[PDB]
Amino acid sequence: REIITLQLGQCGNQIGFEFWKQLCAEHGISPEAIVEEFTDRKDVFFYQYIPRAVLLRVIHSILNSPYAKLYGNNWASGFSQGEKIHEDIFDIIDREADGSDSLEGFVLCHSIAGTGSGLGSYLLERLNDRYPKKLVQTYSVFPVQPYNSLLTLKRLTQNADCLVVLDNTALNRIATDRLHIQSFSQINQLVSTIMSASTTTLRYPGYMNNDLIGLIASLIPTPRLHFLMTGYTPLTTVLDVMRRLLQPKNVMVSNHCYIAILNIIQGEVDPTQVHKSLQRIRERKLANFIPWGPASIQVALSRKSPYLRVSGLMMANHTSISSLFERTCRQYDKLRKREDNFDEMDTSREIVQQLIDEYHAATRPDYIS
Amino acid sequence: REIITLQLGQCGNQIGFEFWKQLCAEHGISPEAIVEEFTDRKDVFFYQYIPRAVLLRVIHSILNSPYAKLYGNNWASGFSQGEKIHEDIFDIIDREADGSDSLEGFVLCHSIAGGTGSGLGSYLLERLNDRYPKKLVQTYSVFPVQPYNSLLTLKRLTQNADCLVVLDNTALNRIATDRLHIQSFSQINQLVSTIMSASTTTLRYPGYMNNDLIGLIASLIPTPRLHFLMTGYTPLTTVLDVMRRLLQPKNVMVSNHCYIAILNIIQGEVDPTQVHKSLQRIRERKLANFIPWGPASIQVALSRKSPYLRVSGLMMANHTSISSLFERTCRQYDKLRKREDNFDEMDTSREIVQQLIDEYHAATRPDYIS
Amino acid sequence: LGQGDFIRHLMDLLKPELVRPATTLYQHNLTGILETAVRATNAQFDSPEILRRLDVRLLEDTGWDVFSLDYHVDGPIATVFTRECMSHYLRVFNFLWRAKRMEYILTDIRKGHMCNAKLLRNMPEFSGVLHQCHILASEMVHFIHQMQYYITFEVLECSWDELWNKVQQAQDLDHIIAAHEVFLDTIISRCLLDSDSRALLNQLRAVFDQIIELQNAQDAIYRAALEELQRRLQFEEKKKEEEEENKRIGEFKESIPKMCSQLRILTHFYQGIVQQFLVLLTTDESLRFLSFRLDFNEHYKA
Amino acid sequence: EEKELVAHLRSIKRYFLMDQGDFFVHFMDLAEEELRKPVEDITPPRLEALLELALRMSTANTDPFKDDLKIDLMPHDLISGLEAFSFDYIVKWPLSLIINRKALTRYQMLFRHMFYCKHVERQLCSVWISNKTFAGAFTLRQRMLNFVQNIQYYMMFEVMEPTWHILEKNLKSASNIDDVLGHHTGFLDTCLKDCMLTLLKVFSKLMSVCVMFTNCMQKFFEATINKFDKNFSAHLLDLLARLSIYSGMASVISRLDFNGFYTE
Ligand SMILES: Nc1nc2c(ncn2[C@@H]2O[C@H](COP(=O)(O)OP(=O)(O)O)[C@@H](O)[C@H]2O)c(=O)[nH]1
Ligand SMILES: Nc1nc2c(ncn2[C@@H]2O[C@H](COP(=O)(O)OP(=O)(O)O)[C@@H](O)[C@H]2O)c(=O)[nH]1
């Protein structure tokens, strides 16, 4: 099962270009697409080695970079032009699909803040037409700006089978708090750390989680509550790492309860004190979950690349993600009272309200019905 | 049995010269046509050493090359000029033929895209079908007013040449930009000569099977019409990896559907006991489809690399998809027929290529017979 | 036959001789032909000693039933072969000679068709029955051109590898005899020349016979179309009467459905002897690798 | 050192304990259609051809001892077609003193119990995409998925792993073969004890309603989804009732429920 990734807009290119650089080094692969001599499953993202990427003036910046041998501002402009090249970019994706053994997903990296917004809205619609059995995960990045942002949310709530939020605001704080930057060339270094460590269980096979649909169906219980946030502590036992992930200082997000937690421990920690910490987290009650359904916390170990110390990443499905929407929803109405049908915006307006209500209904002891 | 080759036009002459360079390098033969000291059956293509070539401006370039010691743009103009010098070239061809012990075939390397080579090869194919009735004719034709010449060459090639191997410059340029990063003729010609030299590998290094051209032809081509083949060259390690990388569309030099015949040539020192396991697993995973009417299988053979010169491999396929290419040309001809003595020969050519495309399209049906 | 280059030229020179009956065949004539082949092919660059023993012998019909090579060996080297390895090789050489002429026949037919259609491509009433002549060929050459591979890879190249591996490490000349003696007990077993596999080989011979009957029923249909074509050439070139030939041309079209009933009943019986052949392979283990070679893409077995 | 043993036990663990993930997600994906067929209907020449192709294409290619995996279809189930599949391992003479037919079928008893639990939540997670473009079954799928993926985690990282981690160290201080023969059977009798393999047949019948519920959803009623709920939830409560009454076998409850749910 192979995962063909997409990169749209200046954001998607920059994070993806730095995502591949983090992966190319984590394996024994020279930037010349040649394996270095110097066990790790590398067929998912690489084709025997060439990465399975379909990019879409930053492109020239990549073609001049040493990695050259490895391959307007309106939302309407993005959706319009995307229709004019419907056959062009689908020729590439189709020829890249059948050449692969068995396609599994479409990890799409785009920012909802110019053309990446309108084009990505076009793709996520068109993929569900032709490919109805392919998961579509998206590493969307949060920042007329209120308009282009929410319009993509209309598509991301009914097409994308998963979504990982990464807002530049909360990232900028961690850029200022523990890195003291005051730049895009620095915050993306943290984004590339989150994207690479997200698929560490696919590239390093273990007991479980050897396929993308194994990481998805565990967290996302229902087709609607499909938004996830991340947590990465290393910026020492398993109890030291588990306690730091639950602190609000580490989450990349600016009653409320969790739905499902998955912990990624990339250390060489002995697998015997893994149940003791989980036992302790239950006692001190450092996190609460949904009251209606049985919600449990899962922890997964892996092995660090010898070619490159304990780290940790947490995939979270938290109801407090509804706050980020309200900030978009709020500023929209203000721009709606300040200035061929203008119905798509209002129709998108309604469905976002259905989503936020579903979150605030998820924290109720009677979320069923 | 000796094979004589012919080189027409600039493209044909250049690819033939590079093929001869490659083949002389594979053996111990200096550019001065003198064997070097430093098993390989070399009598087929060389005469005791001189190559059996018939070259027909770039000749001056070859004569200035260190290998000097080794020897308009219309179709109608080419055909006329070839008719003018019939006896002149045929005296050379006949002396080189009867000088040989037992002639076997006539390899023809030319570009059908346009110029004089197209019409000259047309005329030569017709005249060879006339004179010699028992000689196989294989053609290493290279695909690109151009549509006119191309379709005329296809018309003459679909009945005369008893076999044919297509080479499209578009796919070669695509591969060059992908995995060679060129942006040139002198660069794509390298890969072309590599494929050509690897094509006739089993004839020069004797093995259990495939000691003659008929052994290569009669296995693939089931009927006299379906005689267009495509090539694949994966090394740009087990035999299973080679066979899995060969059947990928990323490597085939081609711009429902199924296969008619597949042949693999492995030049490495691999363990020959794992080939049956490779075929078993390929059948298990169902990576390729075959014709539904007749029993068609895949054949594999091994050889030895030139010791004077690692695991490589080549694949020759009879795929029904090749017809698609013709359609394009056909299409363009129609577009050229409505935009601008008798002008009926082009119409007959269109008719026969339509016949061929219809036959290809009907070949992929469970009732292709009748 | 591990040379290929030499046996190819040797089958082209013995063709005009062996077609005659055996009574007119005398050994002293063939030796000049064999000596000619060794001088023409690549077998000339070879040790003169081993070429002194390579000769012919006549088994005691047709010339393709009594010809065989011997390679007699006497002296100290004779304690490795011991008159039994020379009685097994000839037991093998017959099977490799038959499966070699049954292939050069099927590449001669496949050569005729490439020069056939280059002449009579102007008679659209004959291609309807000429087509069944092509499909039956390409269905017959597969069964033979595939069995050749099982002979090369799964019988010769595989069983010889277990011999050259137990020789470069053996010693005392008694691990060599035992490694060369079992090398002749697998080839007899991997090929169908065993004692209890008798029902299988006699079943294969019928398929070997159907290849000959096609080659006899082909040139009859082939030549009968060249005569009618040649008469049609002269019946119009000298004049450029008209009613006395339309009955000859008219009756010629009426004889076509007669020939079609031949290739329709010859094919339907060829498939009945192959689909029966496969059932006999499911009987003793290496034969399973043959059932896959023939049944690739499941052209049979529905 | 010669005919090494510790570098020989690890290879068995990759397939028998399903440590290697890239090999199973690619094998069941290829040999599923040919396993749902009934017993005495599948040709072993068809499975083994897929097993060989499953190893080489995966990342298990870097394994010197991979050529000792054989298919062995058991006649009895875990007291057909799918419930009658299990690997077999053949070893040479000198190592056959340690890992023998008496102490290899135990490796084959705790394998099928893990190939069953890996199969159900492989297809239970497969229906997850079919429904995603009548609406009350999503909260029931949550009740079974959070049960198998809460048994598998306890079965892989806190049961066999800990015992294996001990054995590796417990073989560095060995002194004689009749001790290694004790640190081995002392490891297999513990894995079969900490797991539910030693009775607790309520798990067997509990798995039937999970796999069968996948069949109902695969037939695309409203009175049948709620029928599975009252049937599965009742079977689950029988488990935690017996898992709690004892003298780990107690920490399993903390893995099943984490939110105080099932406090009845
Ligand atoms: N995190 C992050 N976000 C970026 C980066 N570069 C651009 N962005 C986001 O992308 C948005 C601008 O998108 P833009 O480049 O105009 O899209 P385009 O019109 O398709 O080129 C801004 O709102 C940023 O938030 C980066 O390096 N890191
Ligand atoms: N692949 C390949 N094609 C070539 C090369 N050189 C020329 N050609 C083809 O040959 C055609 C030109 O033929 P031309 O020389 O004008 O024929 P002429 O008029 O008879 O001399 C072009 O369309 C090219 O596609 C080469 O080195 N490689």
- What are B108's strand-pairing partners? B6, B139
In angstroms, rounded to a whole number, what is the distance separating the alpha carbons of residues A85 and A77? 13
Provide the chain B residues 225-244 that lie in CB contact (below 8 A) with chain D.
238, 240, 244
DSSP string, B252-280: BS-----EEEEEEEE-S---TTSHHHHHH
Nearest CA to ligand 2 atom 28: B185
Token pair listed for D173:
């201080």
What is the DSSP pairing of strand A5-7 with strand A53-55? parallel
End-of-domain residue from the set A228, A257, A280: A228
Strands of A313-318's sheet, edge to edge?
A: A229-232, A313-318, A258-265, A297-301
Mutate to test the pocket of ligand 1, among A6, A8, A10, A110 (most ligand atoms within 8 A of CB): A10
Provide the CATH number for the domain around residue B16.
3.40.50.1440
Q: State yes or no: B119 annotated in a binding site.
A: yes
Do B218 and C107 form a contact (C-beta atoms < 8 A)?
yes
In angstroms, rounded to a whole number, what is the distance separating the alpha carbons of residues D129 and B247? 31
CA-CA distances (angstroms) from residue B157 to B164, B361, C250?
8, 19, 34
SS3 category, C216? helix
- What are A261's strand-pairing partners? A297, A316
Spell out the SS3 assignment of A87-137.
HHHHHHHHHHHHCCCCEEECCEECECCCHHHHHHHHHHHHHHHHCCCCECC
Structure determination technique employed: cryo-EM
C-alpha closest to that of B239 among B265, B275, B214, B209: B275
Do C211 and C101 form a contact (C-beta atoms < 8 A)?
no
Same domain, B174 and B185: yes
CA-CA distances (angstroms) from residue A91 to A48, A64, A79, A94, B178?
21, 26, 18, 5, 17
Chains within contact range of chain D (3+ C-beta pairs < 8 Å): A, B
In angstroms, rounded to a whole number, what is the distance separating the alpha carbons of residues B301 and B265? 5
Same domain, A76 and A44: yes
Cα(A153) to centroid(ligand 1), Å: 17
In angstroms, rounded to a whole number, what is the distance separating the alpha carbons of residues A353 and A330? 11
What is the DSSP pairing of strand D69-72 with strand B313-319? unpaired
Residue D70 has what DSSP assignment? E
- B132 in the Ramachandran plot: left (φ > 0), alpha (ψ -120 to 50) or beta? beta
For CA atoms D238, D241, D243, D245, the dihedral sign is negative
A307 Cβ inside 6 Å of ligand 1? no
In angstroms, rounded to a whole number, what is the distance separating the alpha carbons of residues D68 and A284? 49
Q: Give Cα B67 distance to the centre of its chain.
A: 24
Greatest alpha-carbon pair distance for chain D in Å reads 65
Residue B290 has what DSSP assignment? B
**Of the bound ligands, which one is closest to the alpha carbon of residue B74?**
2
Amino acid occupying residue B316: M
In angstroms, rounded to a whole number, what is the distance separating the alpha carbons of residues A106 and A139? 11
End-of-domain residue from the set B299, B319, B339: B319
Chains D and A touch (3+ CB pairs under 8 A): yes
In angstroms, rounded to a whole number, what is the distance separating the alpha carbons of residues C224 and C256? 10
The b/e string for B288-314 (b: 16+ C-beta within 10 A; e otherwise) is bebbebbbbbbbbbbbeebeeeebbbb
Q: Give Cα C197 distance to the centre of its chain.
A: 21
Amino acid occupying residue B90: F
Do C115 and B134 form a contact (C-beta atoms < 8 A)?
yes
**Of the bound ligands, which one is closest to the alpha carbon of residue B11?**
2
SS3 category, A313? strand
| Enclosing H/E stretch for B244 | helix B239-246
Chains within contact range of chain A (3+ C-beta pairs < 8 Å): B, D
SS3 category, D211? helix
Phi, psi of D92 (to 5 degrees): -80, -170
Do C134 and C240 form a contact (C-beta atoms < 8 A)?
no
Token pair listed for B313:
């491999």
End-of-domain residue from the set B229, B245, B271: B229
Chains B and D touch (3+ CB pairs under 8 A): yes
Same domain, B17 and B88: yes
Domain that includes residue A324, residue range: 319-366
Do A54 and A6 form a contact (C-beta atoms < 8 A)?
yes
Collect all residues with Cβ–Cβ distance below 8 Å to A291 and sequence separation of at least 6. A257, A365, D259
Same domain, B25 and B65: yes
SS3 category, D151? helix
CA-CA distances (angstroms) from residue C18 to A336, B130, B343, B359, C59?
100, 33, 55, 42, 13
Residues from chain A that touch D126, judged by Cβ atoms under 8 A, are 213
Do D32 and D123 form a contact (C-beta atoms < 8 A)?
no
Residue B42 has what DSSP assignment? -
- Geometric angle at alpha carbon C267, from C262 and C272, rounded to 5°: 130
Ligand 2 neighbours by CB, cut-off 6 Å: B 9-11, 14, 73, 111, 113-117, 142, 144, 169, 185, 188-189
C-alpha closest to that of A202 among A21, A3, A47: A3
In angstroms, rounded to a whole number, what is the distance separating the alpha carbons of residues C194 and C185? 9
In angstroms, rounded to a whole number, what is the distance separating the alpha carbons of residues D142 and D138? 6
Token pair listed for A155:
């598509």
Tokens 């000088």 belong to B99
Do B75 and B8 form a contact (C-beta atoms < 8 A)?
no
C-alpha closest to that of A105 among A2, A180, A236: A2
| Enclosing H/E stretch for C57 | strand C56-58
* Annotated resolution, angstroms: 4.3
Collect all residues with Cβ–Cβ distance below 8 Å to D189 and sequence separation of at least 6. none
Closest-lying ligand 1 atom to the alpha carbon of residue A73: 19
C-alpha distance from B235 to closest chain A C-alpha (Å) = 11
Closest-lying ligand 2 atom to the alpha carbon of residue B15: 27
Do A297 and A242 form a contact (C-beta atoms < 8 A)?
no
C-alpha distance from B344 to closest chain C C-alpha (Å) = 18
CB contacts < 8 A (B, D): 21
CA-CA distances (angstroms) from residue B14 to B5, B61, B185?
13, 10, 9
Phi, psi of A119 (to 5 degrees): -70, -45
Collect all residues with Cβ–Cβ distance below 8 Å to C258 and sequence separation of at least 6. none
Residue D86 has what DSSP assignment? E
Helix C85-104 with C106-116: angle, nearest 10 deg: 10
In angstroms, rounded to a whole number, what is the distance separating the alpha carbons of residues A149 and A152? 6
SS3 category, A258? strand
Same domain, A214 and A179: yes
In angstroms, rounded to a whole number, what is the distance separating the alpha carbons of residues D32 and C126? 51
Provide the CATH number for the domain around residue A330.
1.10.287.600
The b/e string for C36-56 (b: 16+ C-beta within 10 A; e otherwise) is ebbebbbbeeeeeeeeeeeeb
Cα(A64) to centroid(ligand 1), Å: 21
C-alpha closest to that of D54 among D93, D78, D89, D28: D28
State the Rg of chain D over Cα: 20
Same domain, A14 and A148: yes
Provide the CATH number for the domain around residue A264.
3.30.1330.20
| Enclosing H/E stretch for C93 | helix C85-104
C-alpha closest to that of D142 among D129, D124, D118: D124
Residues from chain A that touch D59, judged by Cβ atoms under 8 A, are 39-41, 43, 205
SS3 category, A74? coil
**C-beta atoms surrounding B121 within 10 Å:** 30
SS3 category, B4? strand
3-state helix, strand, coil in chain A (%, to 5): 45, 15, 40
Tell me whether residues B281 and D30 touch, CB distance under 8 A: no
In angstroms, rounded to a whole number, what is the distance separating the alpha carbons of residues A23 and A45? 9
Based on DSSP, count helices (H) and strands (E) in chain C, helices before strands.
Answer: 16, 2
Token pair listed for A239:
């109890």
Tokens 């938004």 belong to A227
Q: State yes or no: A115 annotated in a binding site.
A: yes
C-alpha closest to that of C222 among C106, C135, C109, C101: C109
Tell me whether residues A210 and D25 touch, CB distance under 8 A: yes
Collect all residues with Cβ–Cβ distance below 8 Å to D210 and sequence separation of at least 6. D120, D124, D144, D147, D148, D232
Tokens 């040539």 belong to B265
What is the DSSP pairing of strand A108-109 with strand A5-7? parallel
Greatest alpha-carbon pair distance for chain A in Å reads 64
- What are B50's strand-pairing partners? B47
SS3 category, A339? coil
Q: From D122, which residue of chain A is nearest by alpha-carbon distance?
A: A214
In angstroms, rounded to a whole number, what is the distance separating the alpha carbons of residues C136 and C143? 11
Do A136 and A213 form a contact (C-beta atoms < 8 A)?
no
A188 Cβ inside 6 Å of ligand 1? yes
Helix B9-26 with B116-131: angle, nearest 10 deg: 70
**C-beta atoms surrounding A354 within 10 Å:** 10
Q: Give A231-234 contacts, CB < 8 A, sequence gap 24+.
A: A231/A313, A231/A314, A231/A316, A232/A190, A232/A193, A232/A194, A232/A197, A232/A311, A232/A312, A232/A313, A232/A314, A233/A311, A233/A312, A234/A310, A234/A311, A234/A312
**Of the bound ligands, which one is closest to the alpha carbon of residue B109?**
2
Q: From B161, which residue of chain C is nearest by alpha-carbon distance?
A: C114
DSSP string, D67-80: GGEEEE--SS----
How many residues are there in chain B? 370
Same domain, B197 and B61: yes
C-alpha closest to that of B319 among B349, B298, B350: B298
Among the partner-chain residues D30, D50, D56, the one whose CB lies closest to the CB of B240 is D56
The b/e string for A260-287 (b: 16+ C-beta within 10 A; e otherwise) is bbbbbbbbebebeebbebbeebeeeeeb
Same domain, A185 and A258: no
- Residues of B with a Cβ under 8 Å from any A Cβ are 181, 245, 248-250
CA-CA distances (angstroms) from residue D176 to D4, D172, D180, D181?
15, 11, 7, 9
Same domain, B108 and B212: yes
C-alpha closest to that of C94 among C217, C1, C215, C220: C1
- Geometric angle at alpha carbon C271, from C97 and C150, rounded to 5°: 40
**C-beta atoms surrounding B44 within 10 Å:** 18
Residue A228 has what DSSP assignment? B
Provide the chain A residues 308-367 that lie in CB contact (below 8 A) with chain D.
none
Do B208 and C157 form a contact (C-beta atoms < 8 A)?
yes
Same domain, A31 and A96: yes
Do A198 and A230 form a contact (C-beta atoms < 8 A)?
yes
The b/e string for A83-99 (b: 16+ C-beta within 10 A; e otherwise) is eeeeeebeeebeebbee
In angstroms, rounded to a whole number, what is the distance separating the alpha carbons of residues A316 and A307? 29
Token pair listed for A219:
């967290």
3-state helix, strand, coil in chain C (%, to 5): 75, 0, 25
CB contacts < 8 A (A, B): 8
Residues from chain B that touch D57, judged by Cβ atoms under 8 A, are 244
Do C99 and C151 form a contact (C-beta atoms < 8 A)?
yes
Residue D158 has what DSSP assignment? I
- What are A180's strand-pairing partners? none
Token pair listed for B17:
């010269």
Residues from chain C that touch B272, judged by Cβ atoms under 8 A, are 153, 157-158, 161
Among the partner-chain residues A135, A278, A296, the one whose CB lies closest to the CB of D146 is A296
Closest-lying ligand 2 atom to the alpha carbon of residue B120: 20
Closest-lying ligand 1 atom to the alpha carbon of residue A166: 1
DSSP string, B109-144: E-B-SSSHHHHHHHHHHHHHHHH-SS-B--B--BB-
Number of domains chain A is built from: 3
Do D251 and D150 form a contact (C-beta atoms < 8 A)?
no
Put simply, whether D131 touches A (Cβ < 8 Å) is yes
Tell me whether residues A99 and B181 touch, CB distance under 8 A: no
Residue A68 has what DSSP assignment? G
Token pair listed for D244:
């709690």
Put simply, whether B245 touches D (Cβ < 8 Å) is no
Amino acid occupying residue A154: K
Same domain, A270 and A336: no
Task: Give the best residue of C36, C106, C114 to mutate against chain B (max B CB count within 10 A).
Answer: C114
C-alpha closest to that of B201 among B303, B277, B54: B303
Phi, psi of D115 (to 5 degrees): -80, -25
Half-sphere exposure in the Cβ direction for B219 (13 Å, CA): 26
In angstroms, rounded to a whole number, what is the distance separating the alpha carbons of residues A185 and A33? 24
Phi, psi of B54 (to 5 degrees): -130, 95
C-alpha distance from B249 to closest chain A C-alpha (Å) = 6
Residue B177 has what DSSP assignment? I
Tokens 């660090």 belong to A304
Strand ranges, E, within B169-247 = 230-233
In angstroms, rounded to a whole number, what is the distance separating the alpha carbons of residues B248 and A99? 6
Do A245 and D161 form a contact (C-beta atoms < 8 A)?
no
Residue C297 has what DSSP assignment? G
In angstroms, rounded to a whole number, what is the distance separating the alpha carbons of residues A40 and A28? 10
Do B156 and B134 form a contact (C-beta atoms < 8 A)?
no
Closest-lying ligand 1 atom to the alpha carbon of residue A116: 20
Among the partner-chain residues B238, B244, B284, the one whose CB lies closest to the CB of D49 is B284
Do A83 and A103 form a contact (C-beta atoms < 8 A)?
no
Tell me whether residues B249 and A98 touch, CB distance under 8 A: yes
Same domain, A42 and A165: yes
